From a paper:
We determined six X-ray structures of the 70S ribosome programmed by 30-nucleotide-long mRNAs with AUG codon and [name] in the P-site and the A-site occupied by tRNALysSUU bound to its cognate codon AAA or AAG, or near-cognate stop codon UAA and isoleucine codon AUA. To discriminate against pyrimidine-ending codons AAC and AAU encoding asparagine, the [name] tRNALysUUU contains one of the most complex modifications 5-methylaminomethyl-2-thiouridine (S, mnm5s2U) at the wobble anticodon position 34.
Two additional structures of the near-cognate complexes 3 and 4 solved in the presence of antibiotic paromomycin, which stimulates miscoding, supported our previous conclusion of the antibiotic mechanism of action. In addition, binding of the antibiotic led to a positional shift of the A1493 phosphate, resulting in partial alleviation of the restrictive decoding centre from the side of the [name] codon. Finally, in the ribosome structures with paromomycin we observed a displacement of helix 69 of the large subunit towards the D-stem of tRNALysSUU that, most probably, enhanced stabilization of a near-cognate substrate on the ribosome.
Residue numbers in the entry:
A (entry chain P8): 1 to 47
B (entry chain 11): 2 to 274
Write the structure that this text describes.
RNA sequence: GUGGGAGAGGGUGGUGGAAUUCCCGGAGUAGCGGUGAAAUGCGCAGAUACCGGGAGGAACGCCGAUGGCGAAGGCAGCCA
RNA sequence: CCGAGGGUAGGGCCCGUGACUGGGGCGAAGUCGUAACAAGGUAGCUGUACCGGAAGGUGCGGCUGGACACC
RNA sequence: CGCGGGGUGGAGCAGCCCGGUAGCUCGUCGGGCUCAUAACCCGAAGGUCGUCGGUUCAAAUCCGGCCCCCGCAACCA
RNA sequence: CGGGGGGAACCUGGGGAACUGAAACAUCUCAGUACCCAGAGGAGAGGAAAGAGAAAUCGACUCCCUGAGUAGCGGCGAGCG
RNA sequence: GUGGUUCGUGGAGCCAUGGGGGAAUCUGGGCGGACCACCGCCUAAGGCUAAGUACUCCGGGUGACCGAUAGCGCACCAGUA
RNA sequence: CGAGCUAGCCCUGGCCAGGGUGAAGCUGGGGUGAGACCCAGUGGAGGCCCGAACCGGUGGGGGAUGCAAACCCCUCGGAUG
RNA sequence: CGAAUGCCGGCAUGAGUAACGAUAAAGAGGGUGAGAAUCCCUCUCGCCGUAAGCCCAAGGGUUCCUACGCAAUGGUCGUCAGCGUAGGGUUAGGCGGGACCUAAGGUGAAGCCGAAAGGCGUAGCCGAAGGGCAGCCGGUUAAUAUUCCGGCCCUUCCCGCAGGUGCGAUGGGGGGACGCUCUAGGCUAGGGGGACCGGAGCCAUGGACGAGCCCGGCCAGAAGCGCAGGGUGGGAGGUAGGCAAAUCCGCCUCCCAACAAGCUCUGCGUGGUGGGGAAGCCCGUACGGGUGACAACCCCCCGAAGCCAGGGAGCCAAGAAAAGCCUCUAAGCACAACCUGCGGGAACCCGUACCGCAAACCGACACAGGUGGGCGGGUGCAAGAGCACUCAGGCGCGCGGGAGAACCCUCGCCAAGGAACUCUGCAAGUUGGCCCCGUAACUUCGGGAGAAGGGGUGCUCCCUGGGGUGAUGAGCCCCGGGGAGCCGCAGUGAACAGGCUCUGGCGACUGUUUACCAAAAACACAGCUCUCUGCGAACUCGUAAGAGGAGGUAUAGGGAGCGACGCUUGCCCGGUGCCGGAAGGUCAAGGGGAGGGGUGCAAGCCCCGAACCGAAGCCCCGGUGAACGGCGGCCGUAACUAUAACGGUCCUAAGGUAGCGAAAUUCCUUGUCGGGUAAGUUCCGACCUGCACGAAAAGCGUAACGACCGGAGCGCUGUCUCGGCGAGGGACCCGGUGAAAUUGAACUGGCCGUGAAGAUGCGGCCUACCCGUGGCAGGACGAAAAGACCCCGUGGAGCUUUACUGCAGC
RNA sequence: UCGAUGUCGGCUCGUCGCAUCCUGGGGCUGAAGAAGGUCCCAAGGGUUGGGCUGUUCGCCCAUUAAAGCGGCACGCGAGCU
């Protein structure tokens, strides 16, 4: 039955997207943390 | 007054619809005069701040003239009487002789051929607006300005009206639809007569759905919730209230007066029995 | 048919004054009410009695009769 | 084919009967009060409405088959 | 068993709780009013305080035992 | 002409917890800690007495040692200092 | 009315200041633990000021530091699969 | 950090085989002082009926280291709101 | 280090055990190859066919095509593949999206607010599955195509020539521009039939050389035209309104139309050219290619839910915006500009493979689950997207071969009986569609109602009514009607398709709910009542700004209870809550300074500090019951007895009225009586000793309704007496692949005792050759889960209030 | 035994005890016969169908030679409900 992953490429980048993070102070520190750790991808894939 | 229905269903039984014989138009309204609107009951933060609202038929908002004093002395013919789904009352479409078209809330007694005016000049007859100070004591009156030049706030709903009981200096004493006795400034415009579509109070919704179409959602009793949810609930097997009956936010809902004491408004009120 | 008459005859709309009650103001003090006699009630948080204002509803004194009208029930301030 | 009638099904009317229940008639000397007949001690009666152990009481309107002092 | 209150003239209640005093209304008895009964008026009689034991100078009264009464409780199981 | 944004930890400023301790818990403690925010920089802060405080004394500020778990503070408790 | 201080309302001063009232320029004003006198100390309501101090992304030296289940999560193409 | 599941609301689109009953209204006729009304045809109302799609999840059986971390079979509720 | 249900890794047991993932289904020949049930071809068989076929959107992201491969991946095998290596493949001015519009929302010059981070906000801006906008048919590749190509159309920009005109916009106006249900007339997709047209070929096995049988009889297309539809007045005069100006728009007046009459726009039709084009035979194909042919290319009918499209009608709940578009004037410019037509030019970026109800997406899997739009043929059955078979197309579900035990699951049938089963007809059966007859209580007059209960149902021939289309005719199609016959056990012949009645409880009703053990008598619901709220409303969210409320105004809005409807809803205001009360009482800060104190030589400076004045709140007085709530006890009494209409007394703020009543409430209790039954703790009626009903936490009824809960009957049954037989998928045997919880170690018997009280393990005695397979579950206090009950802990968390103390709010 | 010994009743399947319900054998009798009463021996076998209730039990209908009482974790849920 309907499961929890219902992928929508637009929704993915307007929610977790790079511009999205950059808009909220909560969100900028998400980036700082990922950069400080050396994540290859600071922000999700979406095509 | 009031269409009824043979009971070919349950709830077609006591269901009741208004009498639209008065409506001289339908499928209008004057396209020049109306924008749109929306809400949810939710507010600018997204939050429900009025409960049990939503759904219901899409409406277009008829723009409507509550300042009649900007046309002083210009006459107008009553053009049409049609349906407004934002109010209890019906709106009269009227053409001015300026060629300006405007909406008026329809007094009881307007046939559509008739001329109407507004201003100190103003014959005293149904449909005409004057400042209160020129209207003779005793007149039944609707759509009243509370303060001068600010627009008509009072007696706007189907069947409502007010009466001039007398005057004192710059002010006149009014018996509102509530029965409250109120001073109002002499310079406030008002139009003579009562609102009409007065049988509005006798519609009988008749089924659940007809409440939803008006955008009214189901309303649940405190009684039926849990204690997180409301001052009355739990224990069950029902229960009496267990406590002086209360709103969800905790204040007492029987008897308890909410008007604020120090309002400078109080200096102008004498009543409300 | 014509010409005339009396009448609270019916329907509708209006409208007047007397009174009662309620409130607002004035003045004023120790009771008021009520009954067979009382008590309940009302009153020094200012009652009753008196003056002024106002709100509202109901019924129409004298004319009025042992009277008129109406099929009966009934119909009574005044105007159309 | 029709056909006495037998069967299955559903109605109608009438009689009988029924735990129980409603009043009613009737039965010398049981209990409670006094409503009515004399302003019957509240004139009575009345349709209706509410009430009350009971008779009755009270409201609104009605009928007379009720009415020598005093204001 | 468990906890609380109770038992007083014929009926119904005070008084106990603060030791010495037993009261109220009805009823009953005698008399009056009345042709007579009720009503009403004038007088009166009537009890050992459930019972047993203790405390004290003195116990309806304070204490304990039993005997009846009314009441609440008896849950997780 | 300048600002903006970034920087491991360190610094100042604005704000600021709870578990826990108290062998329960409110004052108290943990603690001006964790965190969040703003601004510095290679350091930051502070600094030249409207100071100490008993000696007719000492002389700006910072940091270390000591004074000293002293003086005090404290449901005069746990503790704090 | 509060915060700071060892100071928890305490005899509670000092420094700070959200609110009300509200001065003077040497004979002026703050202070020395309520307050008063005396004797002292100091000059608020403007600002800047190296060094001695903290820290370690980074470079180097040295270990009675580990030796692939240890030492950083990662000795290996790891903040990766 | 999450409303890509889920709950509500907002905006904008879309879907609902086929059958069954036959409201008001209108028309004509009767009726009447004039009406109410009665009848007939027409008409096509309704959180109306039957029943697919779509939405559900009634009862039972199976499954129970499953095909499946909610499934399958049979039956069954709504289906212009 | 031996233990921590320790941690990390490795390897065991269970065990060659269970499974190998839908019961749609396979068999043979030939080919390739080291190797073949599994790959390729053919033939036969079976399965889907409102799908299991085809197209689109999401999402996935090279999975697409081909060459060479088989270690692994594939629940077996694999020579095959969605897998490995490599190479190749996605072509647009017109399709989608952007150099267009605006919607919710978002964002945000101005502005407002907030310790900081930030919050808000008009204009603007962004934002789409909405509005706007120009491409149809075929052919082509291994693989792309409205993209390349062929044929035929079309749009914008740019520049030029001609003709026209007051030109000109971010501004004004028009339009765009809209619901739901029903729906006319004309079309098209689509489909059916033809004795008419075209075509390879066929006579089998008894018959048939035939008006035989099988195959096909279209597609697109500018202008012009025709049919059908949409939209639409014309002229003047005045003109104060449309935040400037308008000639436009609006408004008034007069004049002609009254009609699509015209003007205009779209649909279809036809149209120059263009292009398709079967069965069959042949080769030869993961695929399709010659021919059939020079193909034919036409009539009739059925007919949309699609089109004309802003069509029409009715109803109430009253049904987006903005740009493109046209019109109007403004500056401004009138050489310009704009309009119209022709011509040349110029016309960018991204998507484009493939999967796409699934082995390519969401579900850790090649997973019986989930996933929006469109097409979805034929026949028959009343209709239909239902059901059975079947086109095209696509599949036989990636372990097989046997055997024919128990047992299990899914299914079939059953003598006699018929609920005797059982908590309960649970289950299963009966019934079943359509037409016709017929149909009760009661009822809110609609219902109840498919009530119930019956009859018909096929085929052949005769006669015959009405309709649609054509002509009024045939033909074709739809709807019947009557008459006479035939066959079977049976004609809705197979498939899909109510069992029914009586009577209670609860809820009026359709609805709603615990995703995943509860669908209900719970929630909601129209409706009734109370209450607050005069509008910068009350209320709610927010520190605030602001917002909702509501662009509403008491016939409105918030809160609360009750819950259609009918008849109704008593008494008590002592307490509590709310409401009213200008007095009195007490009251905090502040005002007040009687008086007292410290210290100074003193002037002073500095502490205390009585009376008194002084808010709300509490006290006090009163009102309030669809506010919280509450509505008695003992004793006596009637000419049989019983009983008590009646009295007595004690208490209360007041003592339960109506109506119900062993109840969804009744303890005693299976109360007593009556009904039903052969028999009734249930159920129905009644009585009233109501432990412990009772009136809006409503009381008592109520037609209709219900996957609710109770009681009875009929019908019918494998529920049962009581089992039997049969089918299929497992189970069993063989080949291939091959798990799991669990496991101190094991050489693991019975009894009677004993033992921490329930011994394979200790004692005595009995019994017992070693090892397995198929089976059953009594025991290892069997596995699983550090018992959820219970207690403990000065453990924890949700919840309440006249617990304490705070805080917001007021 | 709380790092789990599932708990009433039904059903299925039984097995054992005897304090015997029946059948067999007996003594006594207030045993004429028949038919009972009571006590003794005896565990081989047998011990019904149904209404009510979840019920065990119990009452009841119709029968019977009889309609026995107990134990087996109130026998038996890795057997079912
Ligand atoms: N039949 C007359 C009607 O009945 C009623 O009358 C009935 C009663 O009211 C009346 O009862 C009366 C009683 O009122 C009166 N005051 C006392 C008297 N003894 C009783 O009488 C009764 O009692 C005894 C039995 O013991 C019988 O013998 C006697 O016949 C009988 N009347 O007796 C009648 C029944 O028998 C009313 N009067 C009224 O309804 C009407 O007139
Ligand atoms: Mg997941
Ligand atoms: Mg998307
Ligand atoms: Mg979304
Ligand atoms: Mg990288
Ligand atoms: Mg937001
Ligand atoms: Mg509502
Ligand atoms: Mg409501
Ligand atoms: Mg509700
Ligand atoms: Mg609840
Ligand atoms: Mg919550
Ligand atoms: Mg609460
Ligand atoms: Mg409650
Ligand atoms: Mg309860
Ligand atoms: Mg209570
Ligand atoms: Mg007369
Ligand atoms: Mg016959
Ligand atoms: Mg017959
Ligand atoms: Mg009388
Ligand atoms: Mg009398
Ligand atoms: Mg009298
Ligand atoms: Mg009398
Ligand atoms: Mg008399
Ligand atoms: Mg009375
Ligand atoms: Mg004594
Ligand atoms: Mg408990
Ligand atoms: Mg910086
Ligand atoms: Mg700070
Ligand atoms: Mg502690
Ligand atoms: Mg502790
Ligand atoms: Mg604690
Ligand atoms: Mg601290
Ligand atoms: Mg800080
Ligand atoms: Mg420095
Ligand atoms: Mg500095
Ligand atoms: Mg500095
Ligand atoms: Mg500290
Ligand atoms: Mg401090
Ligand atoms: Mg402090
Ligand atoms: Mg201090
Ligand atoms: Mg000092
Ligand atoms: Mg000085
Ligand atoms: Mg100072
Ligand atoms: Mg000092
Ligand atoms: Mg000092
Ligand atoms: Mg100093
Ligand atoms: Mg510095
Ligand atoms: Mg280094
Ligand atoms: Mg080494
Ligand atoms: Mg390592
Ligand atoms: Mg090694
Ligand atoms: Mg590691
Ligand atoms: Mg959502
Ligand atoms: Mg969602
Ligand atoms: Mg129909
Ligand atoms: Mg219909
Ligand atoms: Mg329906
Ligand atoms: Mg239906
Ligand atoms: Mg239905
Ligand atoms: Mg249905
Ligand atoms: Mg189910
Ligand atoms: Mg809707
Ligand atoms: Mg050890
Ligand atoms: Mg095994
Ligand atoms: Mg096996
Ligand atoms: Mg197997
Ligand atoms: Mg070969
Ligand atoms: Mg070979
Ligand atoms: Mg070979
Ligand atoms: Mg088909
Ligand atoms: Mg895509
Ligand atoms: Mg393999
Ligand atoms: Mg092109
Ligand atoms: Mg585009
Ligand atoms: Mg854009
Ligand atoms: Mg460009
Ligand atoms: Mg754009
Ligand atoms: Mg835009
Ligand atoms: Mg700004
Ligand atoms: Mg914002
Ligand atoms: Mg825009
Ligand atoms: Mg778009
Ligand atoms: Mg579009
Ligand atoms: Mg396009
Ligand atoms: Mg093509
Ligand atoms: Mg122009
Ligand atoms: Mg417009
Ligand atoms: Mg065609
Ligand atoms: Mg056809
Ligand atoms: Mg032959
Ligand atoms: Mg053939
Ligand atoms: Mg065609
Ligand atoms: Mg054509
Ligand atoms: Mg050829
Ligand atoms: Mg239209
Ligand atoms: Mg724009
Ligand atoms: Mg392509
Ligand atoms: Mg599927
Ligand atoms: Mg689909
Ligand atoms: Mg596929
Ligand atoms: Mg998958
Ligand atoms: Mg598979
Ligand atoms: Mg699948
Ligand atoms: Mg599926
Ligand atoms: Mg779907
Ligand atoms: Mg079709
Ligand atoms: Mg059919
Ligand atoms: Mg089908
Ligand atoms: Mg398989
Ligand atoms: Mg049988
Ligand atoms: Mg039978
Ligand atoms: Mg039975
Ligand atoms: Mg069943
Ligand atoms: Mg019925
Ligand atoms: Mg039938
Ligand atoms: Mg029925
Ligand atoms: Mg026949
Ligand atoms: Mg036949
Ligand atoms: Mg046709
Ligand atoms: Mg079948
Ligand atoms: Mg069927
Ligand atoms: Mg059916
Ligand atoms: Mg019935
Ligand atoms: Mg019952
Ligand atoms: Mg219901
Ligand atoms: Mg429904
Ligand atoms: Mg329904
Ligand atoms: Mg619910
Ligand atoms: Mg659930
Ligand atoms: Mg369920
Ligand atoms: Mg249901
Ligand atoms: Mg607030
Ligand atoms: Mg607002
Ligand atoms: Mg607002
Ligand atoms: Mg608004
Ligand atoms: Mg409301
Ligand atoms: Mg309720
Ligand atoms: Mg009441
Ligand atoms: Mg009463
Ligand atoms: Mg009270
Ligand atoms: Mg009171
Ligand atoms: Mg006072
Ligand atoms: Mg003072
Ligand atoms: Mg002195
Ligand atoms: Mg006060
Ligand atoms: Mg009071
Ligand atoms: Mg009873
Ligand atoms: Mg009860
Ligand atoms: Mg009953
Ligand atoms: Mg109740
Ligand atoms: Mg109540
Ligand atoms: Mg109720
Ligand atoms: Mg009831
Ligand atoms: Mg009912
Ligand atoms: Mg339902
Ligand atoms: Mg139900
Ligand atoms: Mg069987
Ligand atoms: Mg078999
Ligand atoms: Mg283990
Ligand atoms: Mg052995
Ligand atoms: Mg043993
Ligand atoms: Mg076993
Ligand atoms: Mg087994
Ligand atoms: Mg076991
Ligand atoms: Mg276990
Ligand atoms: Mg434990
Ligand atoms: Mg639990
Ligand atoms: Mg404790
Ligand atoms: Mg605790
Ligand atoms: Mg245990
Ligand atoms: Mg264990
Ligand atoms: Mg024996
Ligand atoms: Mg024997
Ligand atoms: Mg014998
Ligand atoms: Mg035996
Ligand atoms: Mg035996
Ligand atoms: Mg039973
Ligand atoms: Mg029993
Ligand atoms: Mg036991
Ligand atoms: Mg047992
Ligand atoms: Mg079990
Ligand atoms: Mg059991
Ligand atoms: Mg067992």
């Amino acid at each position: 039955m309907k499961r929890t992953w219902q992928p929508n490429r637009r929704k993915r980048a307007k929610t977790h997207g790079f511009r999205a993070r950059m808009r909220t102070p909560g969100g900028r520190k998400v980036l700082k943390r990922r950069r400080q750790k050396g994540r290859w991808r600071l922000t999700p894939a979406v095509r | 007054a009031v269409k009824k229905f043979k009971p070919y269903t349950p709830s077609r039984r006591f269901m009741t619809v208004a009498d639209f014989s008065e409506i001289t138009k339908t499928e209008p309204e004057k396209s020049l005069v109306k924008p749109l609107k929306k809400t949810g009951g939710r507010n600018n933060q997204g939050r429900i701040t009025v409960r049990f609202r939503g759904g219901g038929h899409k409406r277009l908002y008829r723009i409507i003239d509550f300042k009649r004093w900007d046309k002083v002395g210009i006459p107008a013919k009553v053009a049409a009487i049609e349906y407004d789904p934002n109010r209890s009352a019906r709106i009269a479409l009227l053409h001015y002789v300026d060629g300006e078209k405007r909406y008026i809330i329809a007094p009881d007694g307007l046939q559509v051929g008739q001329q109407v005016v507004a201003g100190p000049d103003a014959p005293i007859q149904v449909g005409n607006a004057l400042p209160l100070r020129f209207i003779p004591v005793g007149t039944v009156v609707h759509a009243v300005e509370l303060e001068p030049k600010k627009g008509a706030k009072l007696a706007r709903a189907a069947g409502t009206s007010a009466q001039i009981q007398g005057r004192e200096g710059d002010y006149v004493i009014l018996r509102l639809p509530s029965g409250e006795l109120r001073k109002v400034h002499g310079e406030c415009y008002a139009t003579v007569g009562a609102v009409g579509n007065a049988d509005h109070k006798n519609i009988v919704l008749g089924k659940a759905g007809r409440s939803r179409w008006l955008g009214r959602r189901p309303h649940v009793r405190g009684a039926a919730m849990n204690p997180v949810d409301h001052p009355h609930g739990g224990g069950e097997g029902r229960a009496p209230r267990g406590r002086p009956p209360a709103s969800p936010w905790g204040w007492q809902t029987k008897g308890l007066k909410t008007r604020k004491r120090r309002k400078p408004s109080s200096r102008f009120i004498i009543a409300r029995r």
